[PDB]
Amino acid sequence: MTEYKLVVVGAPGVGKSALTIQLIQNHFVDEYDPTIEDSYRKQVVIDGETCLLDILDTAGQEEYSAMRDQYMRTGEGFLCVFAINNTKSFEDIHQYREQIKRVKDSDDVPMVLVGNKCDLAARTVESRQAQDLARSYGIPYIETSAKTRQGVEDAFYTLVREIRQH
Amino acid sequence: MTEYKLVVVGAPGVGKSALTIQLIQNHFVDEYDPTIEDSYRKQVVIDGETCLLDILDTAGQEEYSAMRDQYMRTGEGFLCVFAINNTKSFEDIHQYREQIKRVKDSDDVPMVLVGNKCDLAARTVESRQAQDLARSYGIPYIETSAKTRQGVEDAFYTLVREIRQH
Ligand SMILES: Nc1nc2c(ncn2[C@@H]2O[C@H](COP(=O)(O)OP(=O)(O)CP(=O)(O)O)[C@@H](O)[C@H]2O)c(=O)[nH]1
Ligand SMILES: Nc1nc2c(ncn2[C@@H]2O[C@H](COP(=O)(O)OP(=O)(O)CP(=O)(O)O)[C@@H](O)[C@H]2O)c(=O)[nH]1
Ligand SMILES: [Mn+2]
Ligand SMILES: [Mn+2]
Numbered sequence: 165m166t167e168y169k170l171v172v173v174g175a176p177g178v179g180k181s182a183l184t185i186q187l188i189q190n191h192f193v194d195e196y197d198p199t200i201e202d203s204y205r206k207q208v209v210i211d212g213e214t215c216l217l218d219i220l221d222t223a224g225q226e227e228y229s230a231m232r233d234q235y236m237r238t239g240e241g242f243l244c245v246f247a248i249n250n251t252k253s254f255e256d257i258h259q260y261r262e263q264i265k266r267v268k269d270s271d272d273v274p275m276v277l278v279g280n281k282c283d284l285a286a287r288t289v290e291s292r293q294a295q296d297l298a299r300s301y302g303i304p305y306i307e308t309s310a311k312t313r314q315g316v317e318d319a320f321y322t323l324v325r326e327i328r329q330h
Numbered sequence: 331m332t333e334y335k336l337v338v339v340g341a342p343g344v345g346k347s348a349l350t351i352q353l354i355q356n357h358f359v360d361e362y363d364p365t366i367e368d369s370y371r372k373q374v375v376i377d378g379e380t381c382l383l384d385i386l387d388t389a390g391q392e393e394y395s396a397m398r399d400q401y402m403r404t405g406e407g408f409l410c411v412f413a414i415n416n417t418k419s420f421e422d423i424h425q426y427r428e429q430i431k432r433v434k435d436s437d438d439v440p441m442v443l444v445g446n447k448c449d450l451a452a453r454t455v456e457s458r459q460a461q462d463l464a465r466s467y468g469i470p471y472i473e474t475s476a477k478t479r480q481g482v483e484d485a486f487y488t489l490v491r492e493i494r495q496h
Binding site for chain 1: 458470487
């Protein structure tokens, strides 16, 4: 069957693992549990196509930039995640986007900008900010909450459909 | 607030009204009740943006082609719906797509191809068929069921995001 190699990137603590586990294992992880590198494989049907989601859940931090080049090379689609209560993670988006373009030799990689934790009342990043950035990148913006599961399938399936029209 | 003028088009009986009512009024209509022209207005929040969905639910049939030019002129985004157990409705898609391009003076209008009734076991249109068409049109393909509500918000929000990157 068709297999989609999806990579989840973002600053440490934005909810990269929480999004993925919510998709795969249908529960919200509210535990401190930092990632090095986890792979998830799952058979799904998306718009009637049977396919495998091969998800690479990555680490945020300079520790990883080595592991990073390698895993971005083989990713077909990238979830670029920031947290809506973390302005620094929002500004860090540019850095991940540039490393991806570098390793992919591409101005246009299938990519979704994900504003996570949208359930929290204390936003420091306005949706309009993130939406303007997304439009300047030429990619969709999707807000998510791993906590309530709002936007979680949306973000992943939208990325799979981006890879399909690439 | 931002307002998105969305038009739902398709052959008669594909589930145009069922999709819209499911979105708006959270119930599946299993009654014979043909449409001439219904408008739905609803305040939503999509990816943190407060906006109004202004939905034009249209009639299928040559009766309407007059009413059709007029309403396609002002639509910003179009849901092009066929039913997965109706090959004729699938072939009719081309005709709607061409009339839209004609009235819009545009090779590229925000548009999603929607394969409806995906809950029915008796498919006569393979997902792969519809997916190839979607890629040749350069638009997303989304399968839906107004009955189970699978893919309904997906189809509408995806169209709103298409209008946003247009
Ligand atoms: N309320 C809220 N908190 C969330 C959400 N998603 C993640 N969190 C919380 O943020 C913290 C970090 O989540 P985690 O999924 O581990 O993030 P990470 O980005 O993968 C962390 P690391 O980069 O080290 O791998 C956890 O306490 C988690 O419960 C969300 O949408 N809502
Ligand atoms: N099982 C199933 N039947 C559906 C689905 N959506 C629509 N139907 C059924 O198809 C029939 C037509 O639905 P309707 O929403 O009225 O279609 P329409 O395309 O708007 C018809 P008209 O063009 O005349 O306005 C109804 O009996 C409805 O219950 C669906 O996803 N699943
Ligand atoms: Mn993690
Ligand atoms: Mn109708």
